[PDB]
Amino acid sequence: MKAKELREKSVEELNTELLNLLREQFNLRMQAASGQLQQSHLLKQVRRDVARVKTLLNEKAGA
Amino acid sequence: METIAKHRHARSSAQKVRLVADLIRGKKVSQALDILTYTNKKAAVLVKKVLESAIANAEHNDGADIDDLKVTKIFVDEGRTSHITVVVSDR
Amino acid sequence: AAKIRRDDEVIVLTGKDKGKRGKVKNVLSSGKVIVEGINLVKKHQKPVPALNQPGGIVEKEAAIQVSNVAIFNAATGKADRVGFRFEDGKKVRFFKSNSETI
RNA sequence: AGCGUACACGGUGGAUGCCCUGGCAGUCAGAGGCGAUGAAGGACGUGCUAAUCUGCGAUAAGCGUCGGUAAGGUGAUAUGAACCGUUAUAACCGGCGAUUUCCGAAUGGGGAAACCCAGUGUGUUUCGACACACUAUCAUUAACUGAAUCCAUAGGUUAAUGAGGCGAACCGGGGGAACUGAAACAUCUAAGUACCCCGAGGAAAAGAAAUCAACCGAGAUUCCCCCAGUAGCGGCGAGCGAACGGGGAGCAGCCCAGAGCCUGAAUCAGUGUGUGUGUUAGUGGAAGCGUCUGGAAAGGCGCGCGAUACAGGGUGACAGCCCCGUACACAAAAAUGCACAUGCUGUGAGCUCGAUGAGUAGGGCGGGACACGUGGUAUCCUGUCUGAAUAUGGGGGGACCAUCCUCCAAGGCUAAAUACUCCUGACUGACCGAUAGUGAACCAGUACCGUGAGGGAAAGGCGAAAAGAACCCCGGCGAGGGGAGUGAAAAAGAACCUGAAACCGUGUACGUA
């Protein structure tokens, strides 16, 4: 996780992170607001993963 | 056998409750209930609650002898709130 | 390095459990341990119809300090202390009294 | 009957007494400042949250890489829901790096502190919009252009230095209060005290003699001791208060003054390597069984062990032999201050000579003002100039020249000891015990007051362990109490540190119109 995604090129990382932010983050926040998803582990996992990916793509390329 | 019923920090003046209770000292519990039924004094309600709680506790704990139950001790302590205490036993 | 961890055989030195052995399942961060069938308590819990109320008094376990429990080894049958030794590529705990390895 | 006499039962308790997740005062070290690459402090968000401390900043109780640790942790308040993995990619601690909202000196402009409105270049494009950097400030340095004016100068643009303020102290200077003593008080101490600014500072200033003597001498500056609380000053009153001399920390005098000579000679600042010692997460690191009380043993007793470790702390009361720890022995992937041997650009070794600081000192010449109005009276320049010698001119000293010596235009500059802690790290207190101690031990600069600044309280102690009175009954589905149970203990009950009277009620026995 910490290093496996490091070697991925910028294009695929951008595609996957934008996919996540646009679809799955919206779905998770909607589910949380609706009262479902009794277990919040998925929320933390997805939020941390999106934070990781967005934090990247700047030091990997252009720096 | 002894039964104790007390209520702390009552929202009434100590002297009023003391003078209301003084009218009941030495009277039979069965007659005391009738006396307090029509009593218009404000402390009458609280003393009635105390005595009914006392007899209820006696029934829960004591086996019998409620009919001959007598009001043995009654007093009030200054709290101005007040603390009412009543001790009732058959003897 | 934690001298006491999950599922460790110990004997309680004090607290109405002198010489009665037990197996600690976990150790609290404050220095307390949880050994089943050692210190039984009769907790009075507030009933609640939901959340699977245990029902009346709960015969549960209370936590005890690590100081009150000493590790037990079957080699000598008596509780002793523990030291640390360097293996080929790791550090591991070992008992006393001829230095039995855990 | 009603009191009085005392006893017991309690409650209002609150005299007294014990402690602290707290303060206060000292000792040893770094720091003795930060920042336009945007200081501190505020506004607003980041938690499965109804709310808070701390952390963080739309990437937001967290991020990437490298080390130690690693089986519990996801910071807690303060529980609960839900999680991962459990011997190496859970998580924790640290070193280095990226994001790091707005206001705030607060910087594109406006503006009302957390507010609003833009431009340029770069991208991108769903050709609608969105992201990145820059856009205040004056002079100076270099460059391209450059008027009135041919050049120049000013002016226009660019890259670099200089500050957009805050912050405890002092260096030297500028100014600049009140109060008090003088029996009140004009002068004065007060007091150069309160207060503001200036240059940079962590130390600063000063730092090497026509400066003292008195005929003999120590010889750079600063701090301290005796000197000395003396001489002296003081309506010689209150009070203030020396110097010399002798000792402690310290003790570096050189340099431009210009020519030559031989010279890249020791030395200086900068600039790589290696070593050692710290910071920078940490590793290891000894020893008891039984008996009896005791809520629980660390308590009384017996026999044994190490001690370079009996410093300290926790564990139901007092522990070397329970643990954390101490001494002692070790450790750093990368950064890291300090010392050296060490690669290199420059200042840059030492000898002879005078040079000895020129319209310079002195002499001055009328003024204003230096507090100094000449009063005890001295200092700035000017209206200005003659103007020495060139350490050959002298230098001031009490029988003229005193014999004697000086030091004067060299410096510039020079480090040592020395005032202080806003804050940080380590240690200590015969300092205090919640009206003490900090105002504030408790979510205290907190409720609250105050436009802001600022001012500003009361409230600490349950139970070792919440294991917090399960349950039942009365009661109003409350409050409250009683049985039962936990708790050694509930004469420990959440209003829970021990708790006497004063004060208020009940019973007890005596006498009591």
Structural summary, described in words:
- The complex is a heterotrimer of chains A (63), B (91) and C (102).
- Helix content of chain A is 63%, strand content 0%.
- Chain A has 63 residues and is mainly alpha-helical.
- In chain A, helix 1 (10-34) packs antiparallel against helix 2.
- Chain B has 91 residues and is an alpha+beta fold.
- Chain B has helices spanning 14-22, 29-37, 42-61; strands at residues 3-10, 70-78, 82-89.
- Chain C is mostly beta strands and 102 residues long.
- In chain C, 15% of the residues are buried.
- The chains are: A mainly alpha (63), B alpha+beta (91), C mainly beta (102).
- The chains hardly touch.
- Chain C binds one RNA strand of 513 nucleotides through strand 4, strand 5, strand 6 and strand 8.
Number of domains of chain C: 1
The CATH superfamily title of chain B: Ribosomal protein L22/L17
Q: Any idea what the radius of gyration of chain B is? A: 12 Å
Q: Share of helix among residues of chain B?
A: 40-55%
Q: What structural class results from the helix and strand content of chain B?
A: alpha+beta
Q: Give me the number of helical elements of chain B.
A: 3
Keywords (chain C): Ribonucleoprotein, Ribosomal protein, RNA-binding, rRNA-binding
Function (chain C): One of two assembly initiator proteins, it binds directly to the 5'-end of the 23S rRNA, where it nucleates assembly of the 50S subunit. It is not thought to be involved in the functions of the mature 50S subunit in vitro.
GO molecular function, one term (chain C): structural constituent of ribosome
Pfam family, one (chain C): KOW
